[PDB]
Design a binder for this molecule. Structure first.
Ligand SMILES: OC[C@H]1O[C@@H](O)[C@H](O)[C@@H](O)[C@@H]1O
Ligand SMILES: [Cl-]
Ligand code: NA
Length: 358
């Protein structure tokens, strides 16, 4: 498309991740891995609004970006993830969140969106790019037999619609999460996915701020694999560019020339999983291609780092209410702390295994 949200902007670096990385780098005991680890804080990432408590930090990021832009004569761009649906993470245990459908979840969620909108409205010289609700829509394509997801469907659609509709009013550029090649990229899932994304786009009034879709968020797939990972057997769409190339024409037929962003923050090391569905703290992952608008594809606006590597995907402790057996598989790094908390050993391996190297 003509308007790539990133062109002409300088990305505001996540202060949240910067603080995690600075603390982590000081604990890496070779001075050269430590300098490479510290350099990660200069790589743009998405900051997750995974609880309502963080909304005031969004406010600080916007105001800090505005001042940095003025001090430098640049236009600044803040990257966020909207991730607080009620009955969040409906097909897994590790990332259940603060809101529940049974306890006013939708009303709570819409209040969370209102508070985000109210922050963004105050800083019109800062651009915002938001990834909308990782996993939610993909779960509504393949996981309607999961009763928690079935029972969540109407609420998820309402909440996502509220987010899209209201963030559009403050000019936020949005990419709705769309799973990954091993999830929605199976040829047989492409059309049900496109049909859902089309519905969602229509219900939010087709705002031009809804740019398209995000893929591979918090996953590990290649964008363009040298050879298919053996986990992909049976699926000709073995990497994200095959998935996107196959999905985008369906969206175009349905009236929407969508564009895409692709997470590569934990994609540096391929062929490290037993099964494709192994998503949790996959051992040996490395930082992948750095964010760039040099994407290799007409459909892809940017390679991005959405999941911030080093932040855990889920606990391996089976005494936790958030224990998911995926997080104690043989290819899952163990022991692992709660999802969203820092996992130092995992970060250092991401640094050592980075490809391209840091
Ligand atoms: O690290 C990014 C996000 O990862 C998710 O798996 C966690 O549930 C969130 O708490 C965190 O914000
Ligand atoms: Cl079930
Ligand atoms: Na997750």
């Amino acid at each position: 498309s003509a308007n790539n949200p990133w062109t002409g902007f300088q990305i505001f670096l996540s202060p949240y991740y910067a603080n995690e990385v600075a603390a982590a780098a000081k604990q890496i005991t070779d001075p050269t891995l430590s300098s490479k680890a510290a350099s990660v804080a200069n790589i743009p990432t998405f900051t997750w609004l995974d609880s309502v408590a963080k909304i005031p930090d969004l406010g600080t990021y916007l105001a800090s970006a505005s001042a940095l832009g003025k001090s430098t004569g640049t236009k600044q761009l803040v990257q966020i993830v909207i991730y607080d649906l009620p009955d969040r993470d409906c097909a897994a245990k590790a990332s259940n969140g603060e809101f529940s459908i049974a306890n006013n979840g939708q009303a709570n969620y819409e209040n969370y969106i209102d508070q985000i909108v109210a922050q963004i409205q105050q800083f019109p010289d800062v651009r915002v790019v938001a990834v909308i609700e990782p996993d939610s829509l993909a779960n509504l394509v393949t996981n309607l037999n999961v009763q928690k997801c079935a029972n969540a469907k109407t609420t998820y659609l309402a909440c996502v619609n509220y987010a899209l509709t209201n963030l559009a009013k403050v000019g936020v550029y949005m990419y709705m999460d769309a799973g990954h090649a091993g999830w929605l990229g199976w040829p047989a899932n492409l059309s049900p996915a496109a049909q859902l994304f089309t519905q969602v786009w229509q219900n939010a009034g087709k705002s031009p701020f809804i740019k398209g879709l995000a893929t591979n968020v918090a996953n590990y797939n290649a964008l363009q694999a040298a050879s298919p990972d053996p986990i992909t057997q049976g699926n000709p769409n073995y990497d994200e560019i095959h998935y996107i190339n196959a999905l985008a024409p369906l969206l175009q037929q349905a009236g929407w020339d969508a564009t895409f962003i692709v997470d590569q923050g934990r994609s540096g090391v391929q062929n490290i999983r037993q099964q494709w569905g192994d998503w949790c703290n996959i051992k040996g992952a490395g930082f992948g291609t750095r964010p760039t608008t040099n994407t290799g594809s007409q459909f892809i606006d940017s390679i991005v780092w959405v999941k911030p590597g080093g932040e855990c995907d889920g606990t391996s402790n089976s005494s936790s209410p958030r224990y998911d057996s995926t997080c104690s598989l043989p290819d899952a790094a163990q022991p692992a702390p709660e999802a969203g908390t820092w996992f130092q050993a995992y970060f250092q391996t991401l640094v050592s295994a980075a490809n391209p190297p840091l």
